[PDB]
Write a protein that binds this ligand. Structure first.
Ligand SMILES: CCCCCCCC/C=C\CCCCCCCC(=O)O[C@@H](COC(=O)CCCCCCCCCCCCCCC)COP(=O)([O-])OCC[N+](C)(C)C
Ligand SMILES: CCCCCCCC/C=C\CCCCCCCC(=O)O[C@@H](COC(=O)CCCCCCCCCCCCCCC)COP(=O)([O-])OCC[N+](C)(C)C
Ligand SMILES: CCCCCCCC/C=C\CCCCCCCC(=O)O[C@@H](COC(=O)CCCCCCCCCCCCCCC)COP(=O)([O-])OCC[N+](C)(C)C
Ligand SMILES: CCCCCCCC/C=C\CCCCCCCC(=O)O[C@@H](COC(=O)CCCCCCCCCCCCCCC)COP(=O)([O-])OCC[N+](C)(C)C
Ligand SMILES: CCCCCCCC/C=C\CCCCCCCC(=O)O[C@@H](COC(=O)CCCCCCCCCCCCCCC)COP(=O)([O-])OCC[N+](C)(C)C
Ligand SMILES: CCCCCCCC/C=C\CCCCCCCC(=O)O[C@@H](COC(=O)CCCCCCCCCCCCCCC)COP(=O)([O-])OCC[N+](C)(C)C
Ligand SMILES: CCCCCCCC/C=C\CCCCCCCC(=O)O[C@@H](COC(=O)CCCCCCCCCCCCCCC)COP(=O)([O-])OCC[N+](C)(C)C
Ligand SMILES: CCCCCCCC/C=C\CCCCCCCC(=O)O[C@@H](COC(=O)CCCCCCCCCCCCCCC)COP(=O)([O-])OCC[N+](C)(C)C
Ligand SMILES: CCCCCCCC/C=C\CCCCCCCC(=O)O[C@@H](COC(=O)CCCCCCCCCCCCCCC)COP(=O)([O-])OCC[N+](C)(C)C
Ligand SMILES: CCCCCCCC/C=C\CCCCCCCC(=O)O[C@@H](COC(=O)CCCCCCCCCCCCCCC)COP(=O)([O-])OCC[N+](C)(C)C
Ligand SMILES: CCOc1ccc(-c2nc3ccc(-c4nc5ccc(N6CCN(C)CC6)cc5[nH]4)cc3[nH]2)cc1
Ligand SMILES: Nc1ncnc2c1ncn2[C@@H]1O[C@H](COP(=O)(O)OP(=O)(O)OP(=O)(O)O)[C@@H](O)[C@H]1O
Ligand SMILES: Nc1ncnc2c1ncn2[C@@H]1O[C@H](COP(=O)(O)OP(=O)(O)OP(=O)(O)O)[C@@H](O)[C@H]1O
Ligand SMILES: [Mg+2]
Lengths: 665, 569
């Protein structure tokens, strides 16, 4: 079993939502990332457009700017009514702009002393007459571009709102996909739990199974949210960023691409150290909580035996270790995480400065400050998800193991295939043919158990603890297979019918009457909804005092939300009896074992058994050997064997085990 | 926020480290405001004519210097601040445990275990976060943002700053609004998941009844309905949980667009420069974080206030129910005499004990009988100083117990409670609990005295096994008996400690203990009147009073009181 394979299999379901989310994310990323491209075109074509050559043209020409009395038009807006007729430039020296009304070939270090602009470039070029542009004249060289400025600003906002809508759509659809995948997984897990044999439940605490069904599914949901909202989202965001970087400038694009190894190595190291530190911290915190719990519980003997100093010393040892590892984790997060992000950011700034300074030194007119701005913005966007990515990558392990557990549950093979309710009454005749039941293996809890229960009810299985009385109950309901012999109902083998068919013939009452949260009527009916308001069967059980205390148990009273704690101990048994009677089972099995019978209430239980045992084939595992004085066929179980197959009177005449267990009571 | 007012002691104890952290935070903020301005200056020098290799080298070198300085100072101020956080957490754990150890049963009657565990596992986290993370968010939301705003206003421009900073406050307010309404929905969804877990626990624990009525189909229907409800709640959360990234993206891209377009217009008017425009963009990028920090600060500080209030209420204002006073000069108790003592539990109004009086000589053996709930164990609970002394006088040799130190009194009493109390330690450790590791040979002698060694043999000798995670009521009772015995107490109290072993076993144990403890007082509480037949003093407790007082022979002579008529029921 591979966790990744199963996760991908469950994700392939709902692939429409995943595909739609991916597409919406792609479109939103495209818009967001083309934003800064708009900014780099704004800076270059419009603000820095002044650096391009200017050619004199008539005032008739549009996009023409008057300098003193002569109109010029830029090389980009230039047309071919006049070839050159002029060649002017607007150079920059310090914070001032200088108009040069002459053709200039080279470029480089610009100096203006006496209105003679000189470009050195290691050549001294020539001294060109230059005129300061002041501020009004200079702005008049930007008015032509003000309209393109406004146009490009507007495009930015439209794409911004577009990306907003698509970001919301993709995030919501990813969340929907995660939640629906997890819902399907939970449905599968519970459906499987309905097919697991009772051995699995018996050999595994209920809380652990519940955590597997519910908690681990939430862990897998968090894993899906991480994979989608962090790894897929960031992967697409960075792929788009690198596409934009390459479209802007390839040379720096390669350098920026050279950080992905920096992310991989950082992620590996941080995972290595943070997983260890978190494991130690979590284990120590679990130990601390366990110590606090086992100290608050049982504190009376701690104080009475003057152990306070020693327990405090142990708790402080755990606390000091926890402090040590938390400080180690803080040290790792200080040497990595945001600090390293800022270090890499400053390194990126230095790389940009180096590259563009080398470009400007050659004086090839390739400064391209717009590319610099776009690279700054993109790289700044690229350093946002680094910390989240590394944290999630380190944290993946817990959800991975949770998924492993859930899929180990799902991939269980030893499951029961059934689901056929019975179509005819049992007729009440259950027989055993030398059944030999062994729980684990070899060791036998029942040895050649053989008995027949006619339609007459009240068969008693009574004996000292460890005699295998409750094992019969397990065999009857096919909770565990006999492994030998046979069990028959009305001459039909119990191992030749569906478990659901067999359990439709019989009803069960146990020592701890289960009181499912809800209404008393729903608890008596097991929220079946397939029966009407016939809970007067409850009244038939002689519950005439409890149902008038408040409201009405027939789907109108809801006191069972407390697990039956508030209701008297005998009343819970009197609800379970009502449930057993409502379903009208042919064979009633009654596993009763309570040393603290809670006298003054158990009487009603006997009364209840007189109303439910009649017209059935009842098995009573009750102790106390006094409620079965009318049993049609008593049975005494010793060492997993029916040693004295007799009656209340016949056994008394023959003395023996039953006589002893009756005289000693 | 009053949390920092309620934690004045912590900062007073640790003020040098927090002062270093705050100073280094301010310095890091100041020297981190430089790199963007150096980038802008580099751009301006690039555009301007004069830009030689000296400038490039100087920029690279200064950038490296600032990077190293920010790295080191960040490492160290995070070290100081978050080390203070961890120290606060450790100090709170220590203080809470030390307070619990000195508390008495009444405090736990008032305070449940779940709440106490929650305070020691969550409130400590919240307070520690406030001490470290609250202070970081307070400096970055109040110093970092103001510094970046003033730097933009002065170095770059004021019109551009004010225009470009309009959407960030809106983003912060919207983020806090989303935080509130996502927290509400999240609570809703968590409650729905808790309901799911409860239903699953019901369906799995009661699988036998579900299966026995072929109800495993209706069960799946309900489970699927509840999973569907959980799905609806999660989708409701995701509604507002998907409004964050769109909002921040919109209101940060709007801030970038305003900066870029307005800066371009200012450049047209010569009121700015390209380098300053790039610096402004970088400053906005680094200023977006202070907005989140404001809400994070408000949230963390409010949570810390609540947590610290709860912790202080259940840590300080609680007053120990029992205390020493004016230590006496009594080394070994001569006689224990009760004189018309009356005591009622703190959580009840019925007396439960009415003017009980009797004597116990040094070496005298006392047996207590009576029906369940007839103040049987209260008589010794009043002797353990677990509850307020009520009224009367319990004088050891003539001096009330209040004068005796709690340490000495607890030393005299070797207490075996009816309830089983054992810890997740090997049996050796459970028995050694009494003598706190003064010797190891005495273990064999003590276990032989309890006659439990035979049941010690058939268990594996894996450091006397493990207890607290697994095994037998009788074995637990005998382990407790040995633990109380080995301490060599001068008053040994057993409370129904032999209600699980057979009649022969308990008879042998009581015979052996009576033989061994000849000059020591022994209290026996047990419903089996046959287990105190040899006790030179016996009494029967009904309600608050004693039905009769006398030796076993006197009770035999009096009316039949559950002596032997119930043997073999
Ligand atoms: C978080 C998500 C989990 C990622 C786990 C991963 O990538 O490793 C797993 C990818 O194991 C595979 O090889 C899975 C292949 C499934 C996809 C291809 C087949 C369709 C490794 O297998 P594992 O150790 O079983 O987990
Ligand atoms: C697994 C652990 C990670 C965590 C998972 C959990 C997160 C999941 C989230 C994930 C985020 C993204 C979700 C998008 C889902 C889109 C659905 C889709 O169509 O995808 C397709 C993927 O590509 C394929 O076509 C795979 C086909 C595999 C079987 C056939 C291989 C044949 C070649 C053999 C060559 C072998 C050697 C080379 C192999 C490369 C599947 O196509 P489809 O079946 O039409 O559907
Ligand atoms: C997908 C793209 C959709 C584009 C449509 C707009 C989308 C919304 C954009 C909204 C973003 C904000 C736009 C601000 C406009 C510039 C500042 C003044 C002389 C030129 C201006 C004359 C006045 C003409 C002003 C024209 C303003 C047009 C917006
Ligand atoms: C256009 C394409 C856009 C990209 C689409 C891509 C999308 C795929 C994203 C991952 C899918 C799930 C893989 C399994 C997992 O849980 O993560 C894996 C780690 O994965 C990483 O650490 C890298 C994931 C990408 C991070 C973001 C880009 C970083 C670029 C710089 C687990 O690894 P393992 O435990 O060794 O197994
Ligand atoms: C600059 C532009 C940005 C603006 C934002 C800047 C935000 C910066 C963030 C500041 C928060 C700093 C940490 C929290 C301090 C709280 C201290 C406190 O409440 O007072 C305590 C004392 O406190 C001390 O005397 C020790 C404090 C040392 C802290 C480190 C130096 C802080 C100043 C750096 C320079 C208690 O005093 P009290 O109440 O008088 O007595 C209580 C009595 N009790 C002890 C019995 C209980
Ligand atoms: C152009 C050339 C010139 C410029 C070049 C610039 C170069 C770069 C500029 C660097 C920035 C300057 C240093 C910042 C402050 C250091 C940290 C500090 O003061 O606090 C610390 C003192 O730490 C020290 O005593 C100093 C150790 C760091 C020195 C700096 C070099 C790095 C060494 C490595 C306080 O912490 P602590 O007490 O050490 O430990 C706490 C212990 N505890 C956890 C038990 C509580
Ligand atoms: C600039 C100078 C440094 C600036 C900071 C100044 C001084 C503080 C120095 C603190 C020491 C073990 O090597 O270190 C630790 C692990 O550390 C790691 O796991 C390394 C993580 C960071 C690696 C480098 C990233 C860049 C401890 O490992 P352990 O003992 O196993 O626990
Ligand atoms: C001024 C310009 C500079 C601002 C600079 C920074 C400021 C940014 C941060 C400010 C908000 C932070 C507090 C958020 C909060 O809970 O308070 C309110 C948020 O709701 C409103 O304020 C609604 C206003 C309409 C109320 O929240 P509630 O839970 O609904 O109660
Ligand atoms: C306050 C927040 C407001 C502050 C701003 C934050 C962004 C809000 C995003 C709104 C959003 O999700 O858009 C729409 C999603 O998509 C549709 O309903 C499709 C129809 C619109 C087409 C878009 C192109 C509407 O979303 P919703 O269904 O209202 O959720
Ligand atoms: C979405 C947002 C994008 C909007 C971009 C257009 C605005 C900047 C460009 C612009 O034309 O500014 C002009 C207005 O100068 C101002 O007064 C600018 C005010 C901008 C902030 C207002 C929006 C706050 C939200 C500059 O023109 P002038 O020199 O003021 O004449
Ligand atoms: C005990 C817990 O301790 C903690 C201490 C700190 C943080 C913490 N949370 C953070 C969240 C965001 C940032 C942050 N710093 C930034 C600097 C710049 C930028 N940008 C935006 C993207 N590009 C375009 C420009 C620059 C984003 C930034 N985001 C830092 C953060 N630090 C969390 C827990
Ligand atoms: N699921 C199980 N797997 C293995 N052994 C089991 C299982 N359930 C019970 N046993 C054991 O099988 C034997 C049969 O005991 P059973 O369950 O019938 O209880 P009992 O002997 O009737 O009396 P009591 O319920 O009072 O203990 C005992 O050793 C019991 O501990
Ligand atoms: N937590 C409690 N709160 C209030 N009253 C209590 C509490 N525990 C015990 N009591 C009171 O104590 C009475 C009986 O005293 P106690 O339980 O000490 O002895 P007992 O029950 O007679 O004998 P044993 O305790 O050995 O079973 C109960 O009926 C009840 O009134
Ligand atoms: Mg049994």
């Amino acid at each position: 079993m591979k966790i990744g394979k199963t996760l991908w299999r469950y994700a392939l379901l709902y692939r429409k939502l995943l595909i739609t989310a991916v597409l919406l994310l792609t479109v939103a990323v495209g818009a967001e990332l083309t934003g800064p491209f708009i900014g780099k075109k704004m800076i270059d074509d419009h603000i820095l457009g002044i650096e391009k050559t200017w050619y004199e043209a008539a005032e008739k020409d549009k996009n023409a700017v008057q300098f003193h009395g002569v109109s010029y038009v830029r090389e980009d807006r230039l047309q071919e009514p006049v070839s050159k007729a002029k060649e002017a430039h607007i150079y920059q020296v310090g914070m001032a702009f200088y108009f040069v009304d002459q053709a200039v070939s080279f470029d480089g270090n610009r100096t203006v002393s006496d209105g003679k602009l000189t470009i050195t470039n290691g050549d001294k070029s020539r001294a060109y007459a230059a005129e300061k542009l002041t501020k009004q004249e200079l702005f008049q060289f930007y008015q032509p571009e003000i309209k393109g400025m406004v146009l490009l600003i507007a495009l930015y906002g439209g794409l911004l709102v577009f990306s907003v809508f698509f970001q919301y759509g993709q995030h919501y659809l990813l969340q929907m996909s995660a939640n629906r995948i997890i819902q399907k997984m939970r449905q599968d897990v519970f459906s499987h739990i309905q097919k697991m044999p009772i051995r699995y439940f018996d050999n595994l605490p209920a809380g652990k199974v519940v955590a597997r069904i519910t908690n681990d599914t939430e862990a897998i949901r968090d894993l899906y949210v991480t994979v989608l909202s962090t790894f897929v989202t960031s992967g697409i965001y960075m792929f788009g960023i690198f596409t934009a970087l390459f479209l802007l400038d390839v040379k720096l694009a390669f350098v920026a691409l050279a950080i992905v190894p920096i992310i991989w190595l950082w992620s590996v190291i941080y995972r290595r150290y943070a997983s260890y530190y978190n494991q130690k911290i979590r284990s120590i915190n679990s130990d601390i909580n366990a110590k606090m719990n086992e100290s608050i519980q049982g504190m009376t003997i701690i104080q009475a035996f003057r152990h306070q100093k020693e327990t405090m010393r142990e708790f402080e040892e755990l606390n000091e270790s926890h402090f040590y590892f938390q400080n180690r984790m803080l040290n790792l997060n200080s040497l990595m995480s945001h600090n390293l992000v800022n270090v890499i950011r400053n390194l990126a700034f230095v790389a940009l400065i180096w590259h563009f300074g080398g470009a400007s030194l050659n004086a090839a007119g390739i400064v391209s400050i717009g590319v610099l701005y776009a690279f700054v913005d993109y790289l700044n966007r690229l350093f946002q998800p680094i910390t989240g990515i590394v944290n999630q990558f380190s944290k993946l392990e817990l959800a991975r193991v949770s998924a492993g557990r859930v899929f180990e549950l799902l991939e269980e093979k030893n499951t029961e295939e059934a689901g056929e309710p019975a179509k005819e009454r049992a007729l009440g005749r259950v027989e055993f043919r030398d059944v030999s039941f062994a729980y684990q293996e070899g060791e036998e809890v029942l040895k050649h158990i053989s008995f027949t229960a006619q339609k007459g009810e009240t068969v008693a299985l009574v004996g000292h603890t460890g005699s295998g009385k409750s094992s019969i109950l397990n065999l009857l309901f096919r909770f565990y297979d006999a492994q030998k012999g046979d069990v028959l109902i009305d001459g039909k083998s119990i191992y030749n019918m569906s478990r659901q068919e067999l359990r439709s013939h019989m009803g069960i009452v146990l020592q701890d009457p289960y009181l499912f949260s809800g209404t008393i009527g729903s608890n008596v009916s097991l929220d079946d909804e397939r029966m009407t308001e016939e809970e007067i069967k409850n009244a038939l059980r002689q519950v005439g005092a409890e149902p008038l205390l408040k409201k009405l148990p027939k789907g109108i009273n809801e006191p069972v939300i407390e697990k039956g704690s508030t209701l008297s101990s005998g009343e819970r048994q009197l609800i379970s009896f009502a449930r057993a009677l409502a379903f009208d089972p042919a064979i009633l099995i009654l596993d009763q074992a309570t040393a603290h019978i809670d006298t003054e209430t158990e009487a009603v239980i006997q009364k209840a058994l007189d109303v439910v045992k009649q017209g059935r084939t009842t098995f009573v595992i009750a102790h106390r050997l006094s409620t079965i004085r009318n049993a049609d066929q008593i049975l005494v179980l010793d060492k997993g064997e029916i040693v004295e197959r007799g009656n209340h009177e016949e056994l008394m005449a023959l003395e023996g085990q039953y006589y002893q267990m009756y005289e000693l009571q | 926020f009053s949390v920092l007012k309620k934690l004045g002691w912590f900062f007073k104890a640790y003020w040098l480290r927090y002062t270093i952290a705050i100073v280094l935070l301010l310095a890091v903020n100041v020297i981190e405001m430089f790199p963007p301005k150096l980038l802008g200056n580099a751009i301006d020098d690039m555009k301007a004519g004069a830009f030689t290799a000296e400038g490039l080298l100087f920029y690279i070198g200064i950038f490296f210097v600032l990077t190293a300085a920010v790295y080191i100072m960040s490492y160290f101020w995070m070290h100081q601040l978050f080390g203070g956080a961890n120290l606060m957490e450790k100090i709170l754990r220590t203080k809470l445990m030390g307070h619990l150890l000195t508390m008495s049963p009444p405090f736990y009657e008032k305070n449940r275990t779940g709440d106490l565990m929650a305070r020691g596992t969550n409130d400590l986290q919240a307070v520690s976060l406030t001490t470290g993370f609250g202070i970081l968010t307070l400096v970055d939301s109040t110093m970092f943002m103001m510094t970046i705003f003033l730097t933009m206003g002065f170095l770059i421009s004021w019109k551009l700053t004010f225009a470009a900073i309009i959407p960030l406050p809106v983003m912060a307010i919207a983020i806090s609004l989303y935080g509130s309404k996502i927290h509400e929905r999240f609570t809703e969804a968590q409650n729905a998941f808790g309901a799911l877990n409860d239903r699953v626990l019901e369906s799995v624990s009661g699988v036998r009844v579900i299966r026995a009525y072929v109800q495993e189909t209706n069960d799946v229907r309900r489970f699927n309905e509840m999973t569907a409800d959980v799905y609806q709640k999660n989708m409701k959360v995701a509604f507002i949980d998907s409004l964050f990234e769109p909002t921040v993206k919109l209101l940060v891209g709007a801030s970038y667009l305003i900066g870029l377009g307005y800066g371009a217009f200012l450049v047209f008017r010569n009121e700015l420069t390209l380098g300053e425009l790039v610096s402004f963009n970088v400053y906005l990028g680094m200023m977006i974080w202070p907005m989140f920090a404001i809400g994070e600060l408000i949230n963390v500080m409010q949570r810390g206030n609540a947590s610290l209030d709860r912790v202080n209420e259940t840590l300080s204002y609680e007053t120990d129910v029992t205390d020493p006073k004016q230590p006496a000069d009594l080394k070994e108790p001569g006689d224990i005499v009760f004189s018309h003592v009356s005591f009622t539990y703190p959580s009840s109004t019925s007396d439960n004990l009415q003017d009980i009086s009797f004597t116990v000589r040094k070496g005298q053996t006392v047996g207590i009988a009576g029906k369940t709930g007839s103040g049987k164990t209260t008589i010794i609970k009043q002797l353990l100083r677990q509850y307020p002394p009520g009224e009367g006088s319990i004088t050891f040799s003539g001096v009330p117990i209040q004068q005796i130190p709690l340490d000495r009194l607890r030393g005299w009493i070797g207490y075996v409670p009816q309830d089983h109390l054992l810890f997740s330690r090997t049996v050796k450790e459970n028995i050694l609990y009494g003598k706190q590791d003064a010797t190891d040979k005495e273990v064999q002698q003590a276990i032989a005295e309890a006659h439990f060694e035979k049941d010690l043999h058939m268990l594996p000798s894996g450091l006397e096994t493990m207890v607290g995670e697994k095994l037998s009521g009788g074995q637990k009772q005998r382990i407790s008996i040995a633990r109380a015995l080995m301490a060599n107490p001068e008053i040994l109290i057993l409370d129904q400690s032999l209600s699980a072993v057979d009649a022969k076993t308990e008879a042998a144990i009581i015979k052996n203990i009576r033989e061994n403890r000849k000059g020591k007082t022994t209290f026996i509480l047990t419903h089996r009147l046959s287990a105190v037949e040899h006790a030179d003093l016996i009494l029967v407790m009904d309600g608050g009073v004693i039905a009769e007082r006398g030796t076993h022979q006197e009770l035999l002579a009096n009316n039949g009181w559950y002596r032997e008529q119930y043997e073999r029921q």
